[PDB]
Symmetry: D2
Subunit: 215 residues, 4 copies
């Protein structure tokens, strides 16, 4: 039988799943964390302890940015429409792209090009930068070039961690899913009603009323 799909990251056929060769429960038993599973499933590599400390902080820092932004607001709109959590969160996730979250992969991409082709106050940035430059020994050429914005900081850092270029948006997608789930729960706890924008929030730049011509 010719297979329909080819997978390289996980095997569910045994007693429990294997993530890049490692048993899920053995990762739990030996003290590994969510950040380690992220490394295994997205990069097929168990992160080093410093890499795991950076992944953890990137996800924590990126988890939510309030209810006003497109991802969270999409989830809220769906929550208020009575849609179930997974589907509501999927609507918020659909907002992630070139304008909402996209500054991470683009920063990473252009600062990598800058390092190769042109080699020669936000408290979260000052925290992240000081953590990676002082509490780790990770070589951060892209970040160092950028130092010579949180999306800029995170994007440079992920290119410097050698994560595949295809994986970079994953950090923002996963992290913001925590906030979007949270917003859905918050609206459900409040028993929020359907949202319908107020008329004065809309500029109805519409055609004048006209009668339909006969045919």
């Amino acid at each position: 039988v010719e297979p329909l799909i080819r997978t390289t990251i996980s095997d569910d056929r045994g007693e429990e799943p294997r993530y890049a060769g490692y048993a899920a429960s053995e990762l739990c038993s030996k003290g590994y964390g969510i950040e380690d599973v992220i490394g295994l499933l997205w990069n097929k590599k168990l992160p080093t302890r410093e890499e795991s400390e950076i992944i953890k902080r990137i996800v924590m820092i990126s988890a939510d940015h309030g209810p006003a932004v497109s991802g969270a607001f999409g989830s809220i709109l769906a929550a208020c429409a009575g849609i179930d959590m997974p589907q509501a969160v999927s609507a918020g996730m659909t907002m992630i792209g070139p304008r909402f979250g996209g500054a991470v992969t683009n920063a990473g991409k252009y600062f990598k090009m800058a390092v190769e082709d042109y080699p020669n106050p936000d408290q979260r940035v000052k925290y992240l930068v000081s953590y990676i430059k002082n509490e780790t020994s990770l070589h951060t050429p892209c970040l160092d070039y950028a130092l010579e914005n949180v999306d800029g900081t995170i994007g440079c850092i992920l290119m410097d961690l050698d994560f595949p270029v295809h994986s970079l948006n994953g950090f923002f997608v996963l992290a913001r899913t925590i906030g979007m789930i949270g917003h859905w729960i918050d609206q459900n706890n409040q028993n929020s009603r359907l949202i319908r924008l107020y008329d004065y929030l809309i500029n109805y730049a519409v055609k004048p009323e006209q009668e339909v011509p006969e045919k």
Copy 2:
């Protein structure tokens, strides 16, 4: 003219109007600096409370254990179909996530609800609980699996139960009840095991987590796997999928001529 504005939405969990975003009143930079993790942010945004150490260790294992279960299941396969169709990651994973529901992944909330109801209303009457569920609800949420069974046990379930019993002091009436239900249901049919959704739901009810939050633990964890599958197919440059003809049981109308109007 001006307008008297009434708020459109009300939010209690997060705010970005200050110096940096605040999660249930706490700054993310401070959470990072003081040694907290992803499991702590999950607790703040979903329960508005910093988890205890015992809770954080449980949340971490729930997420790790649930992260992925291969490419054959609806969530992963949906993400893979979209990846092969050349769809960008967030939109591809949204398609996979849309599969999460009563049958696949999204039975956590209702498993917690109904096992808690059973503990309260049928503590010494599992057959009463099962009969009530069959007549009034349908399949018992958190019971059953397409591939795991008495002969092919789910070590993810065995691990979470062993961890709770041995590495914590957590009192678990819902989980203990569900394990007694599993003995009764698996005597009827081997497929009627206590599954991962049922296990997680019971543990989270025993931790008194918000009832609405329960499915969130699966949704979030399995997003890790779905992103992983999208990346995997992109690394392989996988082509557009068309389901093979032999896998489709066609039972279609005969070819027929359109009649004149």
Copy 3:
């Protein structure tokens, strides 16, 4: 062993076949979009009367402005630079029990009410409150007895006066509306209720009912995406004065 079973369409022959009919031949013989809907959702070519009803349901339901959840979700995605299909998929995800997707249940319960509570609307309303919750097909955020929904009035008048359809479900729902609007003005028979009743009276498959709204409102959601793209609209961020920030006091993180 097969993975799925399918009965509605087949692309293995010379061209795709919809319930056994070739689309080129349906076009050539003067059939329309409404006939293809009937073939793919009911496996039968509609009668001329049925096709005229389907057409009108779709046209009447196509759009209801940018303020409503489906359109606003599509607009939010358009403004975020998301491509059309994925943006409209976000809008479509909003269609459910509160907005747009009460057609199926409205048809299901009004059809049962005709048989089980023929001369007892209070008994039906009591059964629903205990067994279901809000009556699907009743209520609206903006339309009411004081601001009637002319879409509902039009569809009801078209059916009752311009077709020969026997409408026990729709007639029952109209009697229900007299009872509920006497209690509260917002409890009108809404578009979802009207469509659901009409489709049950037409003996359409019960699972198909929400499809008429999902498809029709896809026209509108695509329109809003195109409109925002033509305007080169920017990323939307909800104004802070539209949000009641009932957030926890800013606190210092305690030591572990």
Copy 4:
């Protein structure tokens, strides 16, 4: 409190504030009463113009021909996967719709854009257009078919081209160029015919529909089929899909013990 409001959204296509919706200024029920159709509402909402009778006849045919292509293809299959997972219709169809993009449906808009570029840049130079495309794009979008060819024509294409040439007086420069391109490409290899995506994409550019709108015709038409498939699976009470193990090539890492931290 009172605020000086700036509108959050600007809309030009429809007004819902009155007794019924107004599509590009026209009352929805009056379009119904005066004998207009779905295709007329499509033109009003997507182009802000009531189509001419001939444009209306073309829109109708495009939608009908594009409505479904069987259950094996990504959009329908996504809807079927969600239907089998117990997901409600709108959410299930949304998953299938997510598959629509560069590989599935995208050849319509790509063919339109490039045959329009050829009419403008290579008006009487098909070899130059075909030389540039092979260098900067690869296979010409809208050209080629696996099973169809000169010996076995696509009757939908022959029907549509014949309709627009013999039942309308519409000027079709993009479609005319694509038919001249087909004469050159079919002479090289018989299978390089003008396909249905190429025929539709060219026609839409010739009807002067906005460039942003072209994908709408496939999206809306295939929503008919995706709804159909969801209903079909629900009528059957189909069970959850989980791909059989033999359909997966598990090109996975060797099993190893987790190292100590």
